Amino acid sequence: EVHKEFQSLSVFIDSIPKKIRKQKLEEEMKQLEHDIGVLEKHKVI
Amino acid sequence: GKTDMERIGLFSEMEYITVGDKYVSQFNRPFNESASKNRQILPGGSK
Amino acid sequence: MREIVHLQAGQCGNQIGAKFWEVISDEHGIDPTGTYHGDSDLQLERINVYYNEATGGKYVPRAVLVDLEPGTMDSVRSGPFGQIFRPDNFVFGQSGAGNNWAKGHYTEGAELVDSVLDVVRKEAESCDCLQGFQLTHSLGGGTGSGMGTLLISKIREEYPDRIMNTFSVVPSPKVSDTVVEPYNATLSVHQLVENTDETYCIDNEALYDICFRTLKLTTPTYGDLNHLVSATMSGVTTCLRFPGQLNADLRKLAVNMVPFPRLHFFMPGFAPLTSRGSQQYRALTVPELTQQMFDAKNMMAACDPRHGRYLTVAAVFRGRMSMKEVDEQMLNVQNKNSSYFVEWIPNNVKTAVCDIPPRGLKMSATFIGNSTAIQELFKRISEQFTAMFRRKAFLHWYTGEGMDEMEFTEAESNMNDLVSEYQQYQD
Amino acid sequence: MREIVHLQAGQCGNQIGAKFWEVISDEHGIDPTGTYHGDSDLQLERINVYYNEATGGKYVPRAVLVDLEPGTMDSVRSGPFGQIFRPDNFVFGQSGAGNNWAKGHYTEGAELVDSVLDVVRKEAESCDCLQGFQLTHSLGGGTGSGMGTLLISKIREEYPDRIMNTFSVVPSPKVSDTVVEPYNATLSVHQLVENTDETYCIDNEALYDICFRTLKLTTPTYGDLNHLVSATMSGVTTCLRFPGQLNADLRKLAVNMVPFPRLHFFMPGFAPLTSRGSQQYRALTVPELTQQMFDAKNMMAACDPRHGRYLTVAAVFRGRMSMKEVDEQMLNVQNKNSSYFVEWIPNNVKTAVCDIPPRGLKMSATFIGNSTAIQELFKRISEQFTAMFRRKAFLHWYTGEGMDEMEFTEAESNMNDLVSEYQQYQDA
Amino acid sequence: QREQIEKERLEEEKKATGRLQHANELRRQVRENQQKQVQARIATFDEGRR
Amino acid sequence: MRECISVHVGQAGVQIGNACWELYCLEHGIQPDGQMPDSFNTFFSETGAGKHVPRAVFVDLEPTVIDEVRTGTYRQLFHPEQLITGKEDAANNYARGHYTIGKELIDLVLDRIRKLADQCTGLQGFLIFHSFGGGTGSGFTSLLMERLSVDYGKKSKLEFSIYPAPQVSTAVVEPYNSILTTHTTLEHSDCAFMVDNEAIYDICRRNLDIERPTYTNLNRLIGQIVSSITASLRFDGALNVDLTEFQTNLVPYPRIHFPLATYAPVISAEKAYHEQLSVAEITNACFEPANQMVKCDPRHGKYMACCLLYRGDVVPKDVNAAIATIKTKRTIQFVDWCPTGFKVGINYQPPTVVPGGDLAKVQRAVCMLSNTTAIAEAWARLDHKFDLMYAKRAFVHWYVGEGMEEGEFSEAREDMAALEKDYEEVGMDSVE
Amino acid sequence: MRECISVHVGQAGVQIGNACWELYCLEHGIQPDGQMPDDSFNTFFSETGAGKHVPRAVFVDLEPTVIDEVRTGTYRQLFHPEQLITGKEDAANNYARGHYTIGKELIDLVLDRIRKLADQCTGLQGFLIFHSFGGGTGSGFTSLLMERLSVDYGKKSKLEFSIYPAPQVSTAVVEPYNSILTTHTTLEHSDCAFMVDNEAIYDICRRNLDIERPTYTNLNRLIGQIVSSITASLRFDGALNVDLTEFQTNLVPYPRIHFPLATYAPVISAEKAYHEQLSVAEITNACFEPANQMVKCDPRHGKYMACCLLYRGDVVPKDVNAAIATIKTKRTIQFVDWCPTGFKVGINYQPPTVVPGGDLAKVQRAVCMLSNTTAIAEAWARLDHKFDLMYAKRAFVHWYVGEGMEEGEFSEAREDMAALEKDYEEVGMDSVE
Ligand SMILES: Nc1nc2c(ncn2[C@@H]2O[C@H](COP(=O)(O)OP(=O)(O)OP(=O)(O)O)[C@@H](O)[C@H]2O)c(=O)[nH]1
Numbered sequence A: 001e002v003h004k005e006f007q008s009l010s011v012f013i014d015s016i017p018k019k020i021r022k023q024k025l026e027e028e029m030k031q032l033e034h035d036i037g038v039l040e041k042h043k044v045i
Numbered sequence B: 001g002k003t004d005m006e007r008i009g010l011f012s013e014m015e016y017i018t019v020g021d022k023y024v025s026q027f028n029r030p031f032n033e034s035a036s037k038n039r040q041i042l043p044g045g046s047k
Numbered sequence C: 001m002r003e004i005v006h007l008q009a010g011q012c013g014n015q016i017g018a019k020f021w022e023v024i025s026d027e028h029g030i031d032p033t034g035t036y037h038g039d040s041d042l043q044l045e046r047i048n049v050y051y052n053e054a055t056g057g058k059y060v061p062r063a064v065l066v067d068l069e070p071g072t073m074d075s076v077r078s079g080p081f082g083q084i085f086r087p088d089n090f091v092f093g094q095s096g097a098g099n100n101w102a103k104g105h106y107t108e109g110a111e112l113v114d115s116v117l118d119v120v121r122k123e124a125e126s127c128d129c130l131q132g133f134q135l136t137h138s139l140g141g142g143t144g145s146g147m148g149t150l151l152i153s154k155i156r157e158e159y160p161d162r163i164m165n166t167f168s169v170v171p172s173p174k175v176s177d178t179v180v181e182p183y184n185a186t187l188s189v190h191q192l193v194e195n196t197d198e199t200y201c202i203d204n205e206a207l208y209d210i211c212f213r214t215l216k217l218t219t220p221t222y223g224d225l226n227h228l229v230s231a232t233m234s235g236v237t238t239c240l241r242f243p244g245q246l247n248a249d250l251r252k253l254a255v256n257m258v259p260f261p262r263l264h265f266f267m268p269g270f271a272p273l274t275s276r277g278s279q280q281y282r283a284l285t286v287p288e289l290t291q292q293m294f295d296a297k298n299m300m301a302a303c304d305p306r307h308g309r310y311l312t313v314a315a316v317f318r319g320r321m322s323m324k325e326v327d328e329q330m331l332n333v334q335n336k337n338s339s340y341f342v343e344w345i346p347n348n349v350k351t352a353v354c355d356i357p358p359r360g361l362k363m364s365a366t367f368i369g370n371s372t373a374i375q376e377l378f379k380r381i382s383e384q385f386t387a388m389f390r391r392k393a394f395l396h397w398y399t400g401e402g403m404d405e406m407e408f409t410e411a412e413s414n415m416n417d418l419v420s421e422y423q424q425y426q427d
Numbered sequence D: 001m002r003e004i005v006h007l008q009a010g011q012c013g014n015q016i017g018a019k020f021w022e023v024i025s026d027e028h029g030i031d032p033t034g035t036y037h038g039d040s041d042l043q044l045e046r047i048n049v050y051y052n053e054a055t056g057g058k059y060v061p062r063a064v065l066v067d068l069e070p071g072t073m074d075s076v077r078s079g080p081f082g083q084i085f086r087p088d089n090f091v092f093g094q095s096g097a098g099n100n101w102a103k104g105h106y107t108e109g110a111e112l113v114d115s116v117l118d119v120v121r122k123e124a125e126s127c128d129c130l131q132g133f134q135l136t137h138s139l140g141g142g143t144g145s146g147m148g149t150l151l152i153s154k155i156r157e158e159y160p161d162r163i164m165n166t167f168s169v170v171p172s173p174k175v176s177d178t179v180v181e182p183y184n185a186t187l188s189v190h191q192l193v194e195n196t197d198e199t200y201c202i203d204n205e206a207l208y209d210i211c212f213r214t215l216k217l218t219t220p221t222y223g224d225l226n227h228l229v230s231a232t233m234s235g236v237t238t239c240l241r242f243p244g245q246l247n248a249d250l251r252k253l254a255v256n257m258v259p260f261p262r263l264h265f266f267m268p269g270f271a272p273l274t275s276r277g278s279q280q281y282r283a284l285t286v287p288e289l290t291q292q293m294f295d296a297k298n299m300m301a302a303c304d305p306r307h308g309r310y311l312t313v314a315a316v317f318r319g320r321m322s323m324k325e326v327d328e329q330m331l332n333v334q335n336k337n338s339s340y341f342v343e344w345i346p347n348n349v350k351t352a353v354c355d356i357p358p359r360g361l362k363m364s365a366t367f368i369g370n371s372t373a374i375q376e377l378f379k380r381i382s383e384q385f386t387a388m389f390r391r392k393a394f395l396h397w398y399t400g401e402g403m404d405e406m407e408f409t410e411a412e413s414n415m416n417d418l419v420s421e422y423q424q425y426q427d428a
Numbered sequence E: 001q002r003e004q005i006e007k008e009r010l011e012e013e014k015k016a017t018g019r020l021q022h023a024n025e026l027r028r029q030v031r032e033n034q035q036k037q038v039q040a041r042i043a044t045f046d047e048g049r050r
Numbered sequence F: 001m002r003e004c005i006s007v008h009v010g011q012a013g014v015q016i017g018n019a020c021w022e023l024y025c026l027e028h029g030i031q032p033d034g035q036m037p038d039s040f041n042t043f044f045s046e047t048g049a050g051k052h053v054p055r056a057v058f059v060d061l062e063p064t065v066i067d068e069v070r071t072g073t074y075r076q077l078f079h080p081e082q083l084i085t086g087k088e089d090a091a092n093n094y095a096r097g098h099y100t101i102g103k104e105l106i107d108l109v110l111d112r113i114r115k116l117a118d119q120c121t122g123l124q125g126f127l128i129f130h131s132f133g134g135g136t137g138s139g140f141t142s143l144l145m146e147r148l149s150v151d152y153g154k155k156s157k158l159e160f161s162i163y164p165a166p167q168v169s170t171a172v173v174e175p176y177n178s179i180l181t182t183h184t185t186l187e188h189s190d191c192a193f194m195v196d197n198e199a200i201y202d203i204c205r206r207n208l209d210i211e212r213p214t215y216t217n218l219n220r221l222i223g224q225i226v227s228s229i230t231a232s233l234r235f236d237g238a239l240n241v242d243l244t245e246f247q248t249n250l251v252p253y254p255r256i257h258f259p260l261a262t263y264a265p266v267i268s269a270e271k272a273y274h275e276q277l278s279v280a281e282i283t284n285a286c287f288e289p290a291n292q293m294v295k296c297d298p299r300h301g302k303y304m305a306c307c308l309l310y311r312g313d314v315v316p317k318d319v320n321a322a323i324a325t326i327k328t329k330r331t332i333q334f335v336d337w338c339p340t341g342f343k344v345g346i347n348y349q350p351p352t353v354v355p356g357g358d359l360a361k362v363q364r365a366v367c368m369l370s371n372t373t374a375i376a377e378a379w380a381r382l383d384h385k386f387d388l389m390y391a392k393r394a395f396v397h398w399y400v401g402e403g404m405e406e407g408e409f410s411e412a413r414e415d416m417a418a419l420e421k422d423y424e425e426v427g428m429d430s431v432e
Numbered sequence G: 001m002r003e004c005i006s007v008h009v010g011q012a013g014v015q016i017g018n019a020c021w022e023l024y025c026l027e028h029g030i031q032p033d034g035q036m037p038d039d040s041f042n043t044f045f046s047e048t049g050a051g052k053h054v055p056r057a058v059f060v061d062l063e064p065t066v067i068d069e070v071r072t073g074t075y076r077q078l079f080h081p082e083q084l085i086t087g088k089e090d091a092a093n094n095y096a097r098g099h100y101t102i103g104k105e106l107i108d109l110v111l112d113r114i115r116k117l118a119d120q121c122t123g124l125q126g127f128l129i130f131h132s133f134g135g136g137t138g139s140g141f142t143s144l145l146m147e148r149l150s151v152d153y154g155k156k157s158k159l160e161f162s163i164y165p166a167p168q169v170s171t172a173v174v175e176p177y178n179s180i181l182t183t184h185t186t187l188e189h190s191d192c193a194f195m196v197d198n199e200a201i202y203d204i205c206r207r208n209l210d211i212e213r214p215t216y217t218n219l220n221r222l223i224g225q226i227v228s229s230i231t232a233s234l235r236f237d238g239a240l241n242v243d244l245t246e247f248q249t250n251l252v253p254y255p256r257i258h259f260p261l262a263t264y265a266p267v268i269s270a271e272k273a274y275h276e277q278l279s280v281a282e283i284t285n286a287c288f289e290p291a292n293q294m295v296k297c298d299p300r301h302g303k304y305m306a307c308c309l310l311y312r313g314d315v316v317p318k319d320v321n322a323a324i325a326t327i328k329t330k331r332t333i334q335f336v337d338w339c340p341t342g343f344k345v346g347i348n349y350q351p352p353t354v355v356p357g358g359d360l361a362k363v364q365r366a367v368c369m370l371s372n373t374t375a376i377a378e379a380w381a382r383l384d385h386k387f388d389l390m391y392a393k394r395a396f397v398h399w400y401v402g403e404g405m406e407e408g409e410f411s412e413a414r415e416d417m418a419a420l421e422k423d424y425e426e427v428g429m430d431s432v433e
């Protein structure tokens, strides 16, 4: 659902908050991809 | 000859579209005139 | 194996083809995201035709989207089936081709055609064999009439054996949403006649007729007007996506339906159309489809086919039907009403029969007829041009991007050469 | 099978036509929903005469209803059996016809003419063999005589081999509801001569008289009189929808009853016409039926049948019975009053027995007669027209939209040609 | 059929309550135009008093 | 969809409609503001949520009766644009309602007429309500009519008008401009019912016992006629008779278009409880030469086309044996070139009642409408009064003053005589 | 992505802009301090990370008494402090001062700021230059601004929301002089020149809106709803989206002829809003009606050459085309022979917003008729008569020649109108076989 929002942005990126909002949708998913990996490669917890 | 301020009160009586045309009714039109003429293409029914 | 690259261009086309990518999406099962969550196996058998394939069991629509204004990208992306497309096919532009054929074909449009063809090369090359192209646009607009005809011309040189289909939105007699509309249409048809294999003509007024007289909808938007065009967009290409008792693909409906080479301005129609309350009171048997579809009220062009002669007709039927009833009515329509068909061709029918019906409906068919009534459609755009060209109309735009009055003389004359040959074989 | 397209036209025609699809549904077992739930079988193998197939086991009526006003149709739809007809064969215009006959024939009815024609041909070609058409209307009305004659001028020029039965309420002497009514009548016979083949003239007079006097029905409405017309609409066609031991259809009833081409004007009639109190005080054996069907009271026309003679009689009988009886006590009528009969044909009576009786009733017999004593239905309008046209009466509407003046003279010259044509063999 | 009748029925009510909300927000505009005119009439009469 | 654009002109017309529009508001569920707590149709339009819009073009050259609607109880029903007031009256002057002051408002009211017509679909026509004699009634009506026909084409125009009363007149010029407005409401007027002033006082004296009521008690009697005559364009029932139905069934030769009116159950509360109003008596009360609305003896003339608009529990046989009985009595002479002479129309809705009014409730009613010759004597009692002025040059300098050529009065006189002799050369019986 | 810089020249322009900019901050959420309490504000506002929606405009007058209310009023925190560039002495109804004498010192500074407002935009859609047509800086400085923008910008949309002098109402005695001189030099560099006078607004907000005694504050609110409909397809989305360049091939005939008119349809007041239903049929009749025309030049006395419909709100697009066809059946609305077409539709979805304390009512529908009528030639010929009636004895010239302007330009300005008169007379004719 954070990927659904990211693909819903405009094709052009030309304003300061649209840079910023793409970046807050950048790091929100990047910290999830780092997290989906640590809980996948380690079966035991 | 009363002035426009004394006439209807407006600065000018710019006369109206709706004074000189016949009422043809805006009842919903069947667009093209070819929607209703002679025999249309009628294939056979089942027997 | 046969695959169809769907180049969709122009605000209109970018919308009248987006619904296509929602109807074909459902016809093959592909859901909003892009995964296949359907039912039958056949749904996921000829997906290769319109859909590609991406890792993760996701079929991306093989469709290049082109609009010189980057605003209708946001409209088609924010639609229901809008995230399904891939971003690099969204080849947009910077400036606006505001309702002017010249700034789609000669100026600012010309600096995107290079960037469209490279994307067109990408989808075409990564493919075993191309059936052809398909352009969904509107004649009477800036980027549709302007770039679209140029984009037809470039791919016709590069790949000169592919079936060049086009679902063109031809201008309307009654109302005009554009006032340079006779200019853009007349100029464009010049390029279509020597660079296309099948031109399907769908104009808005005919869609207005079907959606109220036969469908009985009091509020028809520009969304349900695109649903009917998508249905006949799907119907022409169904015997190469789904099986049948007698198949007809796109080239089969090109060889069998163009008598003389220029006779490709066609006119479609969808057969099982019922209103909201008359759907239970009406039967579903084959005779009902055939009389409704050859009828003039269910015609997606304004040109009434009863002031003309059917040169060629197909009815690409779709359903679990009997071929003899889909043979006897085509004989009956050519014997009882045997004055409105030509005589130098004995039979004027391709009776294509697919097996898989569309969603919900148990039968359907799509009319495609090369009637001689098409000349009335093009004739009207001719006096609407020469009334403007005589007292030389809005041209201080059109010449200013760098063209000449010679092009306007030939565009009208080639279009007048066109309407005379539809009457040379009408009498 | 043998198919009949109905052509409901006019204010009366939409009503008495609706009453037909309330009686013929009750006989064939069709329900207001449209799903058959009857008890017997014989009301199912001949559905394909008045009732077309729809998916779901559903039997949608074959009936194009036409009217130049919304009017009747909103009432037909919002009625007891009004959820049966197709929504697109409810075809209507908006603006009023206003009883101007030429308005419904040379103007606004000339815009609705193709739309009703489109539905007819759509419903006509989609059959095995049509037996005939069936238009019910008024000669003195608005959207009837005006529009109906246009419908019976355009479906015969394109199907000139098919039966044209028409149940048409004729103008009356006394029971009058409109002022320009005999204008409309004398202008509509001119089209009901050269086109229609089976014109059952019917009054309004005796329809009251059957109700208030014979039925003891205290307040004759506009509704219960239509139940009588629907009875003489059914029985004519009951040998081609229900079984029998001697069946006769519409063409059977044509050939054996119209001697000269212009004798297509007929005279209708019921037979077990009774009251609410006399039915226990009586017995519906067929010796009775002949008395109550060759008489003058049970006749559904105003014109008296003793002023003339029946050129030819037919009796489409209905119910379980012998036919020594209805062949010889029918022959006794031929012998007893030989004054009121003719001699240039020896027998002038055609019998036609069905098997299944009407719903409720026992041994009914729809009585149709071709008489020269229909002439006072055809001269009394003519004298009324001449009394008006003498000083050029209410005609400033009729001549306003196109009808000329010799057209009115032709409509009375072709009237009084037909007046003399029935009296040419009267004296005999 | 019935599934989109309700969808057609629920689309009629949202324009019906859309027009009812139209009438009520339009109802707020003549009673702010009434109170503006009423306070002006009080303002003229209190100007006479002062 | 069916509709009728009423327009009410003059002090007479405005308040005649005011009781009529009050009556039209109580059959349909319409509240005085116009919001119910699909037959609200011809004389109401519906906008959005609940607002019910009438189809009137209320007009007067003088502000007085119109601003009573502005301040009266029907203030939030009529529009601020539907009520078109003026500046100054015409003041009983045909010249000052048709050439000077009437010209000054005619362009604005045709707009409101046309803008009111463009929300409509299928109009049968208009309902001009006025009075012959009262300035604006004589002047503005003539000015409205001439521009109405040439613009709107062939549409049914009804002209419920006040004829100048035979004995007394609340005007000195009423036999001086009624001749003048008959010069214009003769060639564009398709059917022009009259109620002259005196007999309606006589109607509300004998039948209704009420002695000495005011202005409003006779306008409610007129409104009942307006409802019943425009009843089958509305509330459903049996055999239905519209506006177009009328002119083919009431008016002879193109200039006979001046029919009369007669209501039937004009009955008080005490009358209703001890006299049964069945169809048989009701249909005969119309043909009484004392219950008919224009004060002129209908026996002196012949009836030429009678149209009986019934209403209520009016089961068909009861009118239908009845109409024969009127053709049996011999004092009602029917012309022999019209043998039928009888139209019937049956509505189902009961006659409504104003909450406060005389007009006791009854289930059946008749709106008798006939072209009798006996309206010519009212025109014979009017035209000779006009000759008695014009012979010695009465109030002429204030008709020529606002603009009027002198021969206009002779022109109105000769067309008046043309009308007078017309109804007798059509009222001579068929002689071989 | 689609930006429109709006330079407002003169007292009339900035006071109009005070009504346009209050409306734009009400449509988009934009609190009057320029802070939202998505991408639809990028036509009239800029953006910084903190949340400052700085408006893309540059206000100029040579008189510091009508923009100093913007630097002191409640809408001060929105506008960039340097975009409001005032002068020190006005042109004072003298074209010669605003164009040649007192405007020359402030033309570089304004043009330098218009540089710094177009670098910031990705693609400039076009210009929206609001000024007056009878003032000194509204005529003179506007004229200097037009000619010098078009030598560095080149080909760009330059639309013109002017205040044309009224036929018999005037607030100045020298308005006909400044009239001819500023449409002689802003006619070769102008793409659209939307004229709106003052008298027609007075009658429109008395006839429809029952408000006697209107002030300049409620005259400019109607102007705001014009430009909010013309620049509505850019910001907000809908079917048949119709832009500034998209107008300027569908409304402008022969390149001399570039003077359209403006009419708003649903100008009905609050009390009459109940006593009306408003569908598309009667609002599209309101524009073609001459009473809701916002110029006192009579459209019935001319022929419509190009006619551009801007629908806005809940307009179901079929009912558009039914309403259009009725107007083509009317004989009173007369169209020319060289447009068998002549309608340009545009359908925006969001309804018309209402300014609080505004005289207009809240409506679901709108029309902004941009019609290119032949009857604006009546408007020019009226004050062309006024020019030739004072210059015949050379009335108000010593103020003009004494401010660095030759008197030859006057005769050049007159003869340039006589061409423009001739063009609007030449176009309208029917081509005879
Ligand atoms: N029958 C009838 N006539 C009325 C009634 N009220 C007024 N009149 C007639 O109307 C006339 C009065 O003038 P109006 O027609 O109302 O015209 P107005 O609005 O007063 O305009 P001016 O007379 O020009 O001042 C009188 O001659 C009356 O005979 C009424 O209630 N019933």
Ligand SMILES: Nc1nc2c(ncn2[C@@H]2O[C@H](COP(=O)(O)OP(=O)(O)OP(=O)(O)O)[C@@H](O)[C@H]2O)c(=O)[nH]1
Pocket: G009, G010, G011, G012, G013, G015, G016, G061, G062, G063, G090, G091, G092, G093, G094, G131, G132, G133, G134, G135, G136, G137, G138, G139, G163, G171, G172, G198, G216, G217, G219, G220
């Ligand atoms: N509609 C409207 N017109 C205005 C407004 N303010 C001024 N005007 C008009 O503008 C005209 C004069 O042009 P301006 O730009 O105001 O001239 P100025 O700035 O006051 O003084 P100059 O420096 O001489 O140009 C006057 O005739 C006014 O009618 C306003 O707020 N609304």
Ligand SMILES: Nc1nc2c(ncn2[C@@H]2O[C@H](COP(=O)(O)OP(=O)(O)O)[C@@H](O)[C@H]2O)c(=O)[nH]1
Pocket: C009, C010, C011, C012, C013, C015, C016, C099, C138, C140, C141, C142, C143, C144, C145, C169, C176, C177, C178, C204, C222, C223, C225, C226, G240
């Ligand atoms: N059928 C259909 N027609 C459309 C649609 N959108 C626009 N049109 C038509 O296309 C014409 C305008 O063309 P346009 O899209 O503006 O061309 P472009 O600007 O070059 O993309 C109008 O006449 C519309 O009627 C749509 O979604 N469906």
Ligand SMILES: Nc1nc2c(ncn2[C@@H]2O[C@H](COP(=O)(O)OP(=O)(O)O)[C@@H](O)[C@H]2O)c(=O)[nH]1
Pocket: D009, D010, D011, D012, D015, D016, D099, D138, D140, D141, D142, D143, D144, D145, D169, D170, D171, D177, D178, D204, D207, D222, D223, D225, D226, F239
């Ligand atoms: N039996 C019967 N006759 C009717 C009914 N309604 C009308 N009529 C007859 O229809 C005739 C008048 O026809 P009219 O209403 O003018 O028909 P139109 O002109 O076609 O609209 C009269 O003779 C009436 O007897 C009805 O419900 N039942």
Ligand SMILES: [Mg+2]
Pocket: F010, F011, F062, F089, F090, F091, F135, F136
């Ligand atoms: Mg008065």
Ligand SMILES: [Mg+2]
Pocket: G011, G063, G090
């Ligand atoms: Mg200043």
